Design a protein around this ligand. Structure first.
Ligand SMILES: CCCc1nn(C)c2c(=O)[nH]c(-c3cc(S(=O)(=O)N4CCN(C)CC4)ccc3OCC)nc12
Ligand SMILES: [Mg+2]
Ligand SMILES: [Zn+2]
Length: 313
């Protein structure tokens, strides 16, 4: 296609130029093309392109097939969110110094997962066990693209590597199910507290990758105020949209979280979301690597902003 040709023939700026190394990065002013290029730089600077012999044109096609499988009519869960999640993973890996703590395969799997964790999301969200029905679909969507002719970016891996990578990609994507996050963080938080976290432990490694995925998945809550407020409104829109739709089809009354009115409650709930789900996670991550402080730091500053709004409301 023409789009593919443009992407595969364009020059890929340096990560520095793209500014994708900093946690404060923002996509809002970038074109789709620019996000695809950033994505290429991501796979490139993580040495995934050469270490795994990815064919440029195939990588390009795969990036487009993934972007393509996201629905733009969905307010928040679209390509951009997937892209920002991967941008954060890249940032955390580089600026957060998390890269030296993982293997190339773990890294390859995480990048792919971040980009694919919400594939074909329809805008139907949950609340807080649902058995990760949605994430299973996202994975199925990810595998499908990874196997489609011309998009096989994983060809080049041995059979054992492919098997390993696939297993990790699946756990990564399923880990983006908040219910599983809540189900597992307790143990993760205990270790960090008792000061006995050990990445050398296979189980503790998996646990970490899961916490990492959810951390990147929620990265918006850590971005600078202007960006956070903007994305927050996208989240709200999708929820309200779901509340209205859910009431249209089924005669169901939306919980305040999904009801369009009571929108003056977002500051209050954003503070609640941050307290109950984000802060502990980003703080704990800082104990793994102090270079991830910006994430924690950005989360706190947002809680102050939302708190001001709630009182002032
Ligand atoms: C599926 C989306 C998960 C998510 N990602 N991000 C970045 C956010 C976010 O910023 N806010 C919320 C969010 C969460 C709750 S909540 O369910 O968690 N809420 C707070 C805590 N408890 C006490 C109940 C209500 C209420 C409102 C929200 O956003 C309005 C824009 N979810 C996500
Ligand atoms: Mg999801
Ligand atoms: Zn997500």
């Amino acid at each position: 296609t023409r789009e593919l040709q443009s992407l595969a023939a364009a020059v890929v700026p340096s990560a520095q130029t793209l500014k994708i190394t900093d946690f404060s990065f923002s996509d809002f002013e970038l074109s789709d093309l620019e996000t695809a290029l950033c994505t290429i730089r991501m796979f490139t600077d993580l040495n995934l392109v050469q270490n795994f012999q990815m064919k440029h044109e195939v990588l390009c096609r795969w990036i487009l097939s993934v972007k393509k499988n996201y629905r733009k009519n969905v307010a928040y869960h679209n390509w951009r969110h997937a892209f920002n999640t991967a941008q954060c993973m890249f940032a955390a890996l580089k600026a957060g110094k998390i890269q030296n703590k993982l293997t190339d395969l773990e890294i390859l799997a995480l990048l792919i997962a971040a980009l694919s964790h919400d594939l074909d999301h329809r805008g139907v969200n949950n609340s807080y066990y649902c058995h990760s029905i949605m994430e299973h679909h996202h994975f199925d969507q990810c595998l499908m693209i990874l196997n489609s002719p011309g998009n096989q970016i994983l060809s080049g891996l041995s059979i054992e590597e492919y098997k390993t990578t696939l297993k990790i990609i699946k756990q990564a994507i399923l880990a983006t199910d908040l219910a599983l996050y809540i189900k597992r963080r307790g143990e993760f938080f205990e270790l960090i507290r008792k000061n006995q976290f050990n990445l050398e432990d296979p189980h503790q490694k998996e646990l970490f990758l899961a916490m990492l995925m959810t951390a990147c998945d929620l990265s918006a809550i850590t971005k600078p105020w202007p960006i956070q407020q903007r994305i927050a409104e996208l989240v709200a829109t999708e929820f309200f949209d779901q509340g209205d739709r859910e009431r249209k089809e089924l005669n169901i009354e939306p919980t305040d979280l999904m009801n369009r009115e009571k929108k003056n409650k977002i500051p209050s709930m954003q503070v609640g979301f941050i307290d109950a789900i984000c802060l502990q996670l980003y703080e704990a991550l800082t104990h793994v690597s102090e270079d991830c402080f910006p994430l924690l730091d950005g989360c706190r500053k947002n809680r102050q902003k939302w708190q001001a709004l709630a009182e002032q409301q």
